[PDB]
Design a binder for these strands. Structure first.
Lengths: 121, 366, 227, 122, 121
RNA sequence: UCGCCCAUCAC
RNA sequence: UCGCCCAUCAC
């Protein structure tokens, strides 16, 4: 079990973060892969970031949790890098995905941010 | 004038009497290899500076190159191997180390022979993890074969099972005894049992209710005990491997690119946290300096590479390859910097193999 | 049917058997353990192990007729060119717990295999370093009664001589396996053996010289004494 | 700046490869004594054995094959680079052992000129 | 002036050793350059070795004097590596040269060895 | 094309 | 039951 999944994720909200990627894909502004995640996670106003649960080495995404604590942004995760690539719409994998504008996903990002902030507390 | 051996360092005068002696402040093989191959160590350095405080200005050593380093350290140093300090220590070792002296010579000679070869893993802690899983699996199969050894030898001496509870002491007993009439006070006292435990066993051998295994049968149960003592020796080789393997620990960036580029990327990100928080598509252009500056201020040509330019496949190759290698290298570096900051665990031979493979792919492509 | 007998040399043994010819043997320093897959005999309170002469020249030389053998019970000896130590196992038996054996090797990986065997054979010390450069092990060796050389590098006359400056006592012995073809391949072996004799006789006295024919070819054994 | 000290082999071939090559020679003394032709083949294992004992073709490289401009590189240049690497390696060992001064980025610049010339020739 | 020198000399012996290279080359057996010198030095076979006074970096030949003590062979120096290369017949320079067989030059190489054994003392 | 030391498996 | 070589291809 990797060191970056610092809270236990329930049978809810994970599929809503997957759905938030699916519907931001043609309607928002979005980046995919961990280095493009990293620059849109530093720069401008990101709204949400998503990670896979099977990233190996774990070290490549282990930077994203402390980087979200310095800058007041929420994070969440989903069960597979190959499914996260397919959610972004690429036939390879993705270790992480970042939302710059939610498009359709704005009410989903508001529900996720409200529920995760009181979970980790 | 000065000479060294297995346990210490000794100064004798040009008539032939002892002035001063030291012992090593690190494990003797690790210090003696340096002094044997010809380089200076702190314990010999503190002795030769004690002779300089005591007013000796000229020095005579055993090794030609230790003598060469001694004059480069600022001393009137020369070489003469038959000199009294070494000639006495090697002629009459029983005067200095006592009538057991060869046992300490032995204990460090075999350790130096274990040390005069290099040790460099790509996965040292993962090898230690498999050695730790092997240590529980070895103890668990020793317990299994000991349960069969107890039950089978109880056909021929059933009184033994309650009487020897300690498992390796039961194994070594069956290994060396085999048949129950080879039991004597001498072999039990060599196996190190107490006079109390030897007041039993022999009492039971004269009255046992066990059956008869032939000489041809009972040697099979002796061979079962001998292969369990092989397994108990492997158990120690696993414990002693880990006791060495925990000295080979290192950072990844030192192996993937080395200090000239690693310390530059750290300094151009301002620190190693900051380098670990950076993307590949900025690590590519760290230390592009005037090229990054004017790509911003005047909207100029995007920098193809920064301080990575002197990498082993960029400043020395065709333009077709120079652009492709720069971002692939910056990808693998963005992994390596995050490993060295957030966990500090070593994988860099695989990070090297992937950058061999992607540059071989750039070769089959271009 | 087999019989174990003493040889004409202290600590050395012989067996005769079902063909009845003599084979060379030693009384085992650590009974029960094997080294190379040797022929063995358990005996009345004892165990004896055989040295096959086709496995090391020093066995073949003792079968041919080498008479001035100096390695004896309780002596101190330094040997160069040991590798994994089949030779060293039989001198470990002959010298016993009373003596002292050093073994120096220059080939780095082949010496490794002897490292656990000397945890039983604790009268041997294995040492990694160039046999031509005594100074490279000077802290972990002492004065000895005997030196033996069977690295038999092109340097082997300097290997024997410089180790015999440093470590051989006054009145002490030397042995060398002269590999004629590796010292000079340009001349008849008797010219190579004559320069080895005339260089060694400007520091030692020579006591015996042996060509290994008709068992082997163009290699010789020399044995010597320092005054 | 007058308090600085740095080893040359540690910068020319990288610390882990330098530290390995020093032991296949027996020591840093030997790496500072031996010829480039021998330093080229150190630790080639059974390829050196069959070149001596069985009379096969000489090995093009030993442990210097792990050098970061030989390991990934195409065949046309691997041998040419291995020869010049063994010369420049023998120099760096001689500087670290006899002199204790630092020139390793010059020694790199010269091998980098020879690698550029190998591209310009082949 | 380099570090590796062990005794002082005028042009005496040195001009005679350069003269010996100029006749051993085509009456005897010779090698040129420092890695071939080092092969003939390490495996003993060089009867006399000649090294330059102007090697740059100086360190590449600095092993040849102590290694010629370790094997017991005479060694000497000469004032310029380009002129030593030209004496060895080649069109570049040479940091050192090795004599394997003096050819006609035996009395001359024996004079050099006998007079260098006045200085290695 | 050859030499020696040395493990292991075998007759 | 086991081994070698020419031409061409690749790192």
């Amino acid at each position: 079990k990797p060191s970056y999944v610092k809270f236990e994720v329930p049978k809810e909200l994970a599929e809503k973060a997957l759905q938030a990627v699916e519907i931001a894909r043609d309607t928002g502004k979005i980046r995919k892969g961990t280095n493009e995640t990293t620059k849109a996670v530093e720069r401008g106003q990101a709204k949400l970031v998503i990670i896979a649960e099977d990233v190996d080495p774990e070290e490549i995404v282990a930077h994203l949790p402390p980087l979200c604590e310095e800058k007041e942004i929420p994070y969440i995760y989903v069960p597979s890098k190959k499914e996260l690539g397919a959610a972004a719409g690429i036939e390879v994998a993705a270790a992480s995905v970042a939302i710059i504008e939610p498009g359709k996903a704005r009410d989903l990002v508001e529900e996720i941010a409200m529920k995760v902030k009181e979970l980790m507390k | 004038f000065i000479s060294e051996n297995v346990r210490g360092i000794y100064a004798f005068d040009e008539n032939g009497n002892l002035i001063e002696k030291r012992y090593f402040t690190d494990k003797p093989e690790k210090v003696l290899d340096q002094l044997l191959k010809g380089e200076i160590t702190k314990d010999l350095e503190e002795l030769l500076n004690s002779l300089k405080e005591k007013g000796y200005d000229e020095f005579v050593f055993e090794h030609p190159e230790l003598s060469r380093r001694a004059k480069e350290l600022g001393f009137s140093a020369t070489t003469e191997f038959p000199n009294i300090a070494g000639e006495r220590l090697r002629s009459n070792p029983e005067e200095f180390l006592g009538e057991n002296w060869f046992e300490e010579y032995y204990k460090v000679g075999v350790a130096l022979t274990r040390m005069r070869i290099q040790e460099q893993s790509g996965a040292r802690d993962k090898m230690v993890i498999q050695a730790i899983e092997a240590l529980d699996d070895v103890d668990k199969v020793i317990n299994l074969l000991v349960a069969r050894l107890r039950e089978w030898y109880s056909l021929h001496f059933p009184e033994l099972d309650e009487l020897l509870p300690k498992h390796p002491q039961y194994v070594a007993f069956v290994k060396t005894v085999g048949h129950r009439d080879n039991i004597n006070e001498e072999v039990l006292r060599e196996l190190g049992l107490s006079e109390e435990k030897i007041k039993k066993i022999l009492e039971a051998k004269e009255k046992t209710m066990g059956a008869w295994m032939d000489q041809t049968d009972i040697e099979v149960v002796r061979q079962l005990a001998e292969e369990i003592d092989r397994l108990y020796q492997l158990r120690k080789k696993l414990e002693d491997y880990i006791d060495r393997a925990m000295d080979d620990v290192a950072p990844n960036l030192k192996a993937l690119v080395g200090a000239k580029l690693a310390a530059r990327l750290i300094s151009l990100a301002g620190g190693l946290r900051e380098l670990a928080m950076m993307p590949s598509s900025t690590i590519q252009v760290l230390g592009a300096e005037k090229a990054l500056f004017r790509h911003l201020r005047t909207g100029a040509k995007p920098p193809k590479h920064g301080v990575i330019y002197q990498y082993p496949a960029i400043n020395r190759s065709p333009w077709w390859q120079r652009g492709k290698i720069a971002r692939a290298l910056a990808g693998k570096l963005a992994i390596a910097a995050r490993v060295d900051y957030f966990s500090g665990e070593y994988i860099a031979e695989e990070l090297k193999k992937e950058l061999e493979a992607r540059i071989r792919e750039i070769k089959e492509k271009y | 049917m087999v019989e174990v007998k003493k040889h004409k040399f202290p600590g050395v043994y012989v067996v005769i058997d079902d063909d009845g010819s003599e084979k060379i043997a030693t009384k085992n320093l650590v009974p029960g353990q094997r080294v190379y897959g040797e022929r063995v005999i358990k005996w009345e309170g004892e165990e004896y192990r055989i040295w096959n002469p086709h496995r090391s020249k020093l066995g073949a030389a003792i079968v041919n007729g080498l008479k001035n053998f100096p390695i004896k019970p309780g002596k101190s000896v330094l040997y160069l060119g040991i590798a994994s130590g089949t030779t060293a196992s039989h001198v470990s038996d002959i010298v016993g717990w009373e003596g002292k054996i050093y073994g120096i090797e220059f080939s780095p990986r082949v010496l490794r295999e002897l490292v656990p065997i000397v945890e039983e054979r604790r009268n041997i010390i294995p040492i990694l370093g160039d046999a031509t450069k005594p100074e490279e092990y000077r802290a972990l060796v002492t004065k000895v009664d005997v030196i033996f050389e069977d690295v038999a590098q092109p340097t082997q006359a300097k290997i024997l001589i410089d180790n015999a400056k440093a470590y051989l006592k006054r009145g002490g012995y030397g042995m060398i396996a002269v590999k004629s073809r590796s010292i000079d391949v340009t001349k008849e072996p008797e010219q190579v053996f004559k320069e080895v004799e005339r260089e060694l006789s400007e520091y030692f006295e020579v006591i015996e010289r042996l060509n290994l024919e008709p068992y082997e070819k163009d290699h010789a054994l020399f044995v010597v004494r320092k005054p």
